[PDB]
C-alpha cells in the first residue's frame, strides 16, 4: 500500500489513505461485502448446526433463522419447523457467494488497478463529480428497488410470507391485494413516534407491509432513473458538502437512524417479527402475565371484574386513560399492546367482559403461559429472568439481543456521522490540520467575545 | 466564551483547577466517611419524617429511599452479618404487595 | 431547627460575602 510519509495518515487511519485511490477503495468495499455475506453464511450454518427440533427458535439464541422463517421457509401453521433445508441452502449460498466476493476484494486490494479513471471511465470517479456521484446513487437505488420488489414477489407468488395475524396461531399465507393506498402507506411515515402511534414500527399487518414495499420499490426505481438522468440543483450544491468523507457522513447519519429504527422494530413490532419465532415482546409478556393470572383465578372460581388491588384500581381489569378496558396491574403501561392472542378476545370496549370470561381458547392459553415463562428478561450470562433470579434457566430473548446490539451500533454510527460531518466540513474549509498561526480568525475579530 | 458564557484565559489557573477539583472532592468524601465511622449519618430529614408520619398522603422520593434502605438492611443483615446470629423468619421481613 | 437554621444560613451567607467583597473592592480600587 503506502506509508505515512506518502499519505500523512497513520495506520490507525490507514483506510483514509485510500479516499482518493478508487480501485483499492472498491476492493475494500467488496471485500467487506464478502465479510457480511460470510458472517451471514457462517452464522446461518452455525444456527442450523445448533438447532433442536423441539424448542422454538427464540429459546436457542437464534437471530437469522427467525428472519428466514418470517419469510415463510420451513414453517407452517402455528410456527413449528417443517424442514431446515431452506435455512441450510441460504447459509451455503451465502458462504459460496462470500468466497466469490472475497476473491474480488482481495484482487482489487492487492493487484487491482490503482485508479479506475484513466482506463474505465464508467467506473472511475472523482468525489466532486456530482453527475457521476448521482449516477452511482441511481445504480444503487435501482438495486434497492429490485430487492424490495423481490420481497414483494416473494409475498405475492413465491409461497407467501408468515402471518401471525391469520387465525389458528398464524401460518404462511400468500398475500393477496396489498394496501397500495398512498394515504395508508404515508400515514405511517407522517405518524408520530410516541405511544399509540409508534411511527413505522406500528405497522401491524402484512398487507400494509407489502404495500409499503411496493411503494418503496417503485419510488426507489424512479429515483434511480431520476438520479442517473439528472445533476444536482444549485440550491443542493450550496446546501451540501461534496467530498467523499461528506458522502460517508451522510450515509452514517442515515444508517444510524436505520439502526435505531431496527432496535425499535425488534423490541416492539410483532408482525414483521412474529412472536412465535422471536419470542414475546416486553408488552406481550406483561399482558401474557396478567392474562394467564386472570384465567387461573377464573378457573379457581373467582370474580375478575371485582377484586380491586391494594390501590383500589382493579387487579385484573381497569380502564385505560381513553376509556377502553385493559389488563390490571403495572401492565397497564403496556395497554397499547396488540397481539394475535388478544384480538379474538378484544372488541369495541377494549377487553370484552363476557368474551374474556367465556371465549378462552386452549392455544391462546398455552401461548400466554409460554409468553410468561420466556419473557425478554435476562443477564449477560444468558440467565433468564430479573437480575435477582436464580441461575437455572438459560435464556435471553432474541428481541433483547437485537434491540441492545442495534441501539449500540446506531449510537456509535450517529457519533461517527458527527466525526465525519465535522471533518468533511473542516477539510473542505482547510481546517482539518489546525489553525494557521498567522491567519488566525479570532485575531481578526473584536474582543469581548 | 461564546458557547458556555465563561471560559478560561489563564493556563496556570486552568491546570490548577484541574488539580483542585478531584482533590477537594475526594477530601470531602473522606471527611464524610469519617463521619460515618461514628454512625454520624445524614440519614433523615426530621421535618419531612414527622410530616410523613403525621400524613399518609405525603409521599416523596426521599421517603421512597428511606423505605428502600429499610428493605436493604432487613434483607441483607441475615446473610451479611453471621456474627449477630440474626435468624429473621420470613414472617417479619418488610415486603410490598406481590413481587 | 427552624429559626436557628435561618440565622445560621444568613450568617454563612453574609460573613464570607463581606470578607470577599472587602477584598474585591480593595483590589478594584487599585484600578
Amino acid at each position: 500500500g503506502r506509508d505515512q510519509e506518502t499519505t500523512g495518515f497513520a495506520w490507525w487511519a490507514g483506510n483514509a489513505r485510500l479516499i482518493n485511490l478508487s480501485g483499492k477503495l472498491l476492493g475494500a468495499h467488496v471485500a467487506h461485502a464478502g465479510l457480511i455475506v460470510f458472517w451471514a453464511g457462517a452464522m446461518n450454518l452455525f444456527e442450523v448446526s445448533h438447532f433442536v427440533p423441539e424448542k422454538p427458535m427464540y429459546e436457542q439464541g437464534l437471530i437469522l433463522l427467525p428472519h428466514i422463517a418470517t419469510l415463510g421457509y420451513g414453517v407452517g401453521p402455528g410456527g413449528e419447523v417443517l424442514d431446515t433445508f431452506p435455512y441450510f441452502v441460504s447459509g451455503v449460498l451465502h458462504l459460496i457467494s462470500s468466497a466469490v466476493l472475497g476473491f474480488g476484494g482481495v484482487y482489487h486490494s492487492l493487484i487491482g488497478p490503482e485508479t479506475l479513471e484513466e482506463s474505465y471511465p464508467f467506473f472511475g470517479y472523482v468525489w466532486k463529480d456530482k453527475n457521476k456521484m448521482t449516477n452511482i446513487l441511481g445504480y444503487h437505488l435501482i438495486i434497492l428497488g429490485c430487492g424490495a420488489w423481490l420481497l414483494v414477489l416473494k409475498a405475492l407468488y413465491f409461497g407467501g410470507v408468515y402471518d401471525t395475524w391469520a387465525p389458528g396461531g398464524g401460518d404462511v399465507r400468500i398475500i393477496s391485494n396489498p394496501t397500495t393506498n398512498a394515504a395508508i402507506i404515508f400515514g405511517y411515515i407522517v405518524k408520530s413516534p410516541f405511544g399509540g402511534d409508534g411511527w413505522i414500527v406500528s405497522v401491524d399487518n402484512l398487507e400494509d407491509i407489502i404495500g409499503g414495499h411496493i411503494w418503496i420499490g417503485t419510488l426507489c426505481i424512479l429515483g434511480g432513473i431520476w438520479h442517473i438522468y439528472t445533476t444536482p440543483w444549485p440550491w443542493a450544491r450550496r446546501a451540501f458538502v461534496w467530498s467523499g468523507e461528506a458522502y460517508l457522513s451522510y450515509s452514517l447519519a442515515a444508517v444510524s437512524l436505520m439502526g435505531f429504527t431496527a432496535c425499535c422494530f425488534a423490541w416492539f413490532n410483532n408482525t414483521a417479527y412474529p412472536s412465535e419465532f422471536y419470542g414475546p415482546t416486553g408488552p406481550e409478556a406483561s399482558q401474557a402475565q396478567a392474562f394467564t393470572f386472570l384465567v387461573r383465578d377464573q378457573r379457581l372460581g373467582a370474580n375478575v371484574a371485582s377484586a380491586q388491588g391494594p390501590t383500589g384500581l382493579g387487579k385484573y381489569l381497569m380502564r385505560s386513560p381513553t376509556g377502553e378496558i385493559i389488563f390490571g396491574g403495572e401492565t397497564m403501561r403496556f395497554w397499547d399492546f396488540r397481539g394475535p392472542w388478544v384480538e379474538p378476545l378484544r372488541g369495541p370496549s377494549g377487553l370484552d367482559l363476557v368474551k374474556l370470561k367465556n371465549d378462552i381458547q386452549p392455544w391462546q392459553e398455552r401461548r400466554a403461559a409460554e409468553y410468561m415463562t420466556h419473557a425478554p428478561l435476562g443477564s449477560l450470562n444468558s440467565v433468564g429472568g430479573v437480575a435477582t433470579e436464580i441461575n437455572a434457566v438459560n435464556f435471553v430473548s432474541p428481541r433483547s439481543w437485537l434491540a441492545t446490539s442495534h441501539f449500540c451500533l446506531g449510537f456509535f454510527f450517529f457519533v461517527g456521522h458527527l466525526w465525519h460531518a465535522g471533518r468533511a466540513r473542516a477539510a473542505a474549509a482547510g481546517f482539518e490540520k489546525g489553525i494557521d498561526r498567522v491567519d488566525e480568525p479570532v485575531l481578526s475579530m473584536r474582543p469581548l467575545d | 466564551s461564546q458557547i458556555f458564557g465563561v471560559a478560561f484565559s489563564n493556563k496556570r489557573w486552568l491546570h490548577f483547577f484541574m488539580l483542585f477539583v478531584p482533590v477537594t472532592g475526594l477530601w470531602m468524601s473522606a471527611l464524610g466517611v469519617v463521619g460515618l465511622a461514628l454512625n454520624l449519618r445524614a440519614y433523615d430529614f426530621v421535618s419531612q419524617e414527622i410530616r410523613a408520619a403525621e400524613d399518609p398522603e405525603f409521599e416523596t422520593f426521599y421517603t421512597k429511599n428511606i423505605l428502600l434502605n429499610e428493605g436493604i438492611r432487613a434483607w441483607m443483615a441475615a446473610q451479611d452479618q453471621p456474627h449477630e446470629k440474626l435468624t429473621l423468619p420470613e414472617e417479619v421481613l418488610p415486603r410490598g404487595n406481590a413481587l | 431547627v427552624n429559626i436557628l437554621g435561618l440565622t445560621a444560613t444568613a450568617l454563612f451567607i453574609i460573613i464570607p460575602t463581606s470578607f470577599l467583597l472587602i477584598l474585591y473592592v480593595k483590589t478594584a480600587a487599585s484600578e
Binding site: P447, L448 | - | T9, I13
Partner: peptide
Amino acid sequence: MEALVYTFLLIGTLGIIFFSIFFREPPRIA
C-alpha cells in the same frame, strides 16, 4: 418559611451565574 429560603438561595446562585457570564473581567490580548 423554608421554601422562601430555598427560593432565595437558588435565585442568588442564578444571579451570581448571570453576573459571572455577562459581567466578567474582559480578557486582554496582551
